[PDB]
Amino acid sequence: GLTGTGVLTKSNKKFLPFQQFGRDIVDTTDAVRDPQTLEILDITPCSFG
């Protein structure tokens, strides 16, 4: 259900066994979890300017 766009890379975040996604101070999604692999992935906005 969580939709968006960006680049998916590997991060060193240590989530909890009951956490799904992560948010920052400005309340924007920057990290999710794989429902099939349970891997820590970070989301970065694509290039613009």
Place this chain on the structure above:
Amino acid sequence: FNGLTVLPPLLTDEMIAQYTSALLAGTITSGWTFGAG
């Protein structure tokens, strides 16, 4: 972010430091003569 961009300044800190050093040198070597000629 969502369309917010910060523009860098034109003059770097090294140029401001050079300007300050030149002002100090002109003050300690000449005084008040380099400002009017």
